[PDB]
């Protein structure tokens, strides 16, 4: 039996979001540029894909801007905010459990000039408010969160966060890596007041290739990619028209069916907690604060990729640092530590499939 | 019937391409990053793809990198390789004709302080050797040039613009716009001595979301993307997988193809170009070196943008700065329509195209 439990990493593409993206491969492949009819045919579709991402969102079509990833939405957001304020301010905000691709851009931005600074997390992975609150000062820009961590799954507190900022400094932008949320856990962006938001729709069951950046009306911003104009003039290059149209519908479906898929990664989650628990393993994850469908354990007594290697000759897929590092975890914790991650699809039967392969390998080591 | 004639803007993917990217997004679907079994899976195919692309250009895999397109590609190349000479070197020449994916960064380079040069074209859309010569200079870095003109279908003297100026400064690094050769024109950079280039797969019926970069082993190069650690560090970001392989067979088809495609796409451009001709079409677009499925017509009282407007509803697509470089009437420039073919099209189109375009001249 083959059984992708490695769903943060990326996702298969939902069997209705392709159907839908093979016509404009095959059918409707204009450029959406073009003036022609099926250049305007094209057009029509993404900017459909655009609004029907804003209706999911709750914010206005003319905030939502497509780039190639997630990490792309990132950098642009984080560079060319820095850049907008050069020479005015210099303090970025941020914590020690972003993904690289935030923490990647921050190590660029301390190069350039940029005052980089880290409010720590809590050993359940939760941002520290109290210390947030000292941290953020008048040349501090910007702030980016993330709304929850896709290593141990631990959802952070984006609204506190929001406002504990605003009260501190209302000029300050806020920005959220928003990337696991979708389909997860509910995310609107309609009563949040934030200024910036990025996501992954390889990590809903869209298609790798497109990120999905959300930029509040107004706010600071200019281009990362110069050239014809695309997306309002912020993002040139031709758009990925299949990849928009199905990330827009992926988005779309895994909101749709968000209560009952959270529930079923929720039931199952827990069947492993307890299945991982009996057979020795340390549960990192906090489950009352947590993404319903991560579970990241650890046997102390093997070497986290050892276990993946041996899982993964089973037909079993599992991932397996910065993060537990932030969060005081014991380096023997880090060392074995393998990380869960369900979809809607995964079924109990591949959970009993799971616990009983697991303890076999776990025997024989 | 339906007539894509604008095949320079994009193209349809392929059968044999679209069949293989959709293993990927079905099956395949694995984190190329991830050290499980379908994170192996992922990355083999996507390591294997990057040979493909390399096999074809004649070059070293670990010198292929892949973006989201081939504007990604030149904001990558022209913005780090700048910055690499920041307070060093300060001059950049390019060309009045460049796609504005060049025009538009260097416009931004220029903004934050360097100095961009911008050698002329002479009335065909071909650089201007002479002026190159002598525009290249000590504190030139690097200079971006085309290997053909979108537009007007203009090829470049690719291998005089390097040789030429790397007599003039052995140091200065040479990037080329190759985004219109594949599938049209024989590229290779093997023996091309360039240290950058630029592809954009939808332009050879790859899909749309890829871009395929050259960069020399060596040469000056940061990330334009930082982040997890994807393409030797230098381009973060989940990988397109799915994107990646469907590009690499695209450019191994059409490179393998060319011979037949290029014949025929040459064919079928004389009879739209006689019959266009037999009409009162000024022809734009220089024939003797020009891609073979490009033509650049103008009608005389009739803007390019109503007669585009009629083609499209009669099923037939074609598009409407290079033309002002290269000293183009502004009668015959607001008149310019542009039609690109591909190796799919047909005489019965160039036909049902004639016969069309006469009606609709009629009624004009
Ligand atoms: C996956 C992920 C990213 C990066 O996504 P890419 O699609 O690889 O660009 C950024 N942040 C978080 C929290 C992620 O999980
Ligand atoms: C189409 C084109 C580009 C840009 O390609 P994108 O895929 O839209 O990034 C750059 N240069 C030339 C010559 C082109 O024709």
Redesign the pocket.
């Known amino acids: 039996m083959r059984v992708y439990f490695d769903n943060?990493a990326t996702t298969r593409v939902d069997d209705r979001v392709l159907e839908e993206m093979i016509v404009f491969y095959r059918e409707k492949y204009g450029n959406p540029n073009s003036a022609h009819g099926m250049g305007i045919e094209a057009n029509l579709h993404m900017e459909k894909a655009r609004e029907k991402v804003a209706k999911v969102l709750g914010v206005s079509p003319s905030e939502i801007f497509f780039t190639s990833?997630?990490?792309?939405s990132?950098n642009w957001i984080l560079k060319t905010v820095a850049e907008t304020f050069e020479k005015r301010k210099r303090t970025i905000i941020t914590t020690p459990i972003e993904?690289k691709?935030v923490l990647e851009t921050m190590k660029y931005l301390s190069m350039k000039g940029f005052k980089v600074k880290y409010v720590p997390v809590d050993s359940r992975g939760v941002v520290k408010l109290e210390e947030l609150e000292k941290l953020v000062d008048e040349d501090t820009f910007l702030v980016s969160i993330?709304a929850a961590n896709?290593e141990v799954g631990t959802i952070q507190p984006v609204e506190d966060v929001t406002r504990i900022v605003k009260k501190k400094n209302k000029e300050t932008l806020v920005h959220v890596?928003a990337?696991?949320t979708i389909g997860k856990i509910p995310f609107s962006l309609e009563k949040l007041e934030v200024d910036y938001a990025?996501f992954?729709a390889?990590?809903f069951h869209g298609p790798k290739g497109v990120?999905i950046t959300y930029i509040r009306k107004g706010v600071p911003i200019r281009p990362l990619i110069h050239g014809g104009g695309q997306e309002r003039g912020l993002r040139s290059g031709t758009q990925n028209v299949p990849g928009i149209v199905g990330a827009a519908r992926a988005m779309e479906i895994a909101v749709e069916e968000l209560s009952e898929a959270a529930k079923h990664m929720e039931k199952l989650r827990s069947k492993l907690v307890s299945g991982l628990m009996n057979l020795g393993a340390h549960i990192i994850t906090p489950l009352e604060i947590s993404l319903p469908n991560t579970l990241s354990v650890s046997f102390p007594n093997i070497r986290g990729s050892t276990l993946q290697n041996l899982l993964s000759g089973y037909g079993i897929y599992v991932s397996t640092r910065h993060v537990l590092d932030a969060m005081g975890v014991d380096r023997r914790i880090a060392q074995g530590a393998i990380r869960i991650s369900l979809c809607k699809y995964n079924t109990e039967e591949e959970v009993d499939y799971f616990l009983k392969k697991i303890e076999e390998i776990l025997s024989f080591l």
């Open positions: 943060n990833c997630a990490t792309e990132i993904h691709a993330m896709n890596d990337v696991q990025s992954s390889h990590k990120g």
